[PDB]
Symmetry: D2
Subunit: 144 residues, 4 copies
C-alpha cells in the first residue's frame, strides 16, 4: 500500500509535533537531516521561532555511511529531525553523532519507533510513504 | 476532535468511489444533494463521464429535539438508474428522507459515521460518531500565527 | 501555454466573486451549468448561504439534457469559464433575467457574461482542478 | 496588496528554477538561507538529486532606520560551485551581505521585487515592491466564516 502525504497534511503533523516541543526556550537550534528533514525542520523552526537551523548530510555506499556534511557539537540543546523512521539504519548513526540531541520525526514505522524520542504518525512497516516533494499536481485521465 | 479534509484528499476518496461505480453506462445520471453532495457529485460526474447531473435541495431547521425538514427543490423519478450522492451521513435523518424519495436509487456518500453507516449503499471513509468533519468548502488557506 | 488552477486558487476566486454578489438576500437561487459550474456554484452557495441550487445540462451534438424552470428571475447562472461564448449564448436565451457569471473569461466571451473574476488569454488552456490530481513526478535530474 | 502563495504553486516555481540549473553535475551542493531558503533549497535538492545541503543563518534586527545583522551560523568556502538560495528578495540588503560572504556562489530566489532584482543571478516570479508575498509555511487550512 502507498500512503499519500500532501503539503497540507504534512504541515498539520509538523504543527502537532511543534506543540510538544514547547517551551521554545529549552532549545538552541534545529539540526535537519538532509534531505528528508529539511522541510519538516523548516516548519518547526518557524512554529518555534528558531533561527539557528543547521543540517547533516549522510550518503550510502554499497552498507557503509558517508557523512558528507556534519553539524558541530554533540547535539545538546538541539532538535534533530528527519521526515520518517523506517528501520533505524540512519537513525542509529544520527544517535551516536548527537547523543544528547532530541531526535524527532513525523512518521515512524514499527521497527524504527523505539529509536526516536518522539514522532507524530504511525505507519505500517509495509507501507510506502509518498512525501509531497516527490509529487505534483498534474492531469489525471477519467476512469470512464 | 476535528477531522480535517482538504480538496486533495476529498478528490482521492471521490476517485476511489468512482472506480466502484464502474461501468458508467449503467447510470442514467447523478442526483446531488445540495449543498454537501454537489462537489462529490461533480467529481463522480467527471470520472464517470456523466453530464446528466441534477439536484435535490433539502432545508433542515433543528428545533430543540425535532427537525423541520423541507424539500425546496426536487429531482424527478424513482431514482432508478441514478446515483444519489451526499458528502456524509451523521445520524441518517437526511438519508432516510432521501431514500424515501428515491427508493430505486444507489445512495452513496464519501464519509459515513456509525449511526448512518447502515443507511447508505456504499461509502469510502469511516468516521467516529464524536468526530466532526471539516469539509474543504468551509476552509481556506490563511495566516496562522507561530505556536511560539 | 497551460494554466494550472489548484483547488485553493479556484476557491479564492470564487470568494472574490461571492463578495460582488452581495447582498445574499437579492437572490432566489443558483443555477449551475453542468459540469464546469458545479464546483464554482457550490462554493458561491456556501458563501452566500444559498441552499436552492439547481443545474442545467446542455449538450454538443443545442441539446438540453436537463434544465431548471423559468427565465431565471432572481437566479444566478454560473459556469467555470467563457472561451468563445457559444455556450453562453444558449444560457442567455433560456434564462434572460438571470445574472450570468463565470470564474475565468477569455477575450471572445467577456461581453457575454455579466461578471467574472480572472482574465485569461484566448490561446491559454485552463487546466481545472477536477481534471488533475496529486501524483508522483519524476526528478528533473 | 496581498499575494497568496500555496504549497503547490511554490513547488511549480521551484521546479522551473531547477530546470534552468541543469546539468546538476555542475553543482557541489546547495546553501539554503534560514529560514526562507530552507524549503526552496530542499525542493531543488530533490529535483537536482543533490544530497549536500548546508545553511547560513543570519538574524536581522531593525532599529528605526538601521538594520543590525548577526551571523548565527555559516557554511564554509566562497560558494564556488554552490547554489545559494533564499525564498525572495525585498530590498536586497540581505542578498548584498550573502554576496559578500559567497562571491563565487550562484545566488537565486523564487520571487524577486524591483529593488533587489539586480542582486540575484536568477529568479522565477516578478513581484511588485508594494506587494506582500504570503508564504505557505506561514499559512494553514482552517475554518473560514461564510460571506453571508
Ligand atoms: N461539515 C460537516 N457537516 C456535518 C457534519 N455532521 C453533520 N453535518 C451536516 O449535517 C448533515 C448530516 O446530518 P444527518 O441527516 O446525517 O443527521 C450533513 O449533510 C451536513 O450538512 C460534520 O462532521 N461536518
Ligand atoms: N513572508 C514574507 N516575508 C517577506 C516579504 N518581504 C520581505 N520578507 C522578509 O524579509 C526578507 C527580505 O528582506 P530584504 O533584505 O530583501 O529587504 C525576506 O528574506 C523575508 O524574510 C514578503 O512579502 N513576505
Amino acid at each position: 500500500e502507498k500512503y499519500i502525504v500532501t503539503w497540507d497534511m504534512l504541515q498539520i503533523h509538523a504543527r502537532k509535533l511543534a506543540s510538544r516541543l514547547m517551551p521554545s526556550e529549552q532549545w538552541k537550534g534545529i539540526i535537519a537531516v538532509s534531505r528528508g528533514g529539511l522541510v519538516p525542520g523548516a516548519l518547526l523552526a518557524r512554529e518555534l521561532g528558531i533561527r539557528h537551523v543547521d543540517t547533516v548530510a549522510i550518503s550510502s555506499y554499497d552498507r557503509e555511511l558517508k557523512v558528507l556534511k556534519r553539524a558541530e557539537g554533540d547535539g545538546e540543546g538541539f532538535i534533530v529531525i528527519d521526515d520518517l523512521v523506517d528501520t533505524g539504519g540512519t537513525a542509529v548513526a544520527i544517535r551516536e553523532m548527537y547523543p544528547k540531541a532530541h531526535f524527532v520525526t513525523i512518521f515512524a514505522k514499527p521497527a524504527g519507533r523505539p529509536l526516536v524520542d518522539d514522532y507524530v504518525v504511525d505507519i505500517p512497516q509495509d507501507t510506502w510513504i509518498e512525501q509531497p516533494w516527490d509529487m505534483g499536481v498534474v492531469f489525471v485521465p477519467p476512469i470512464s
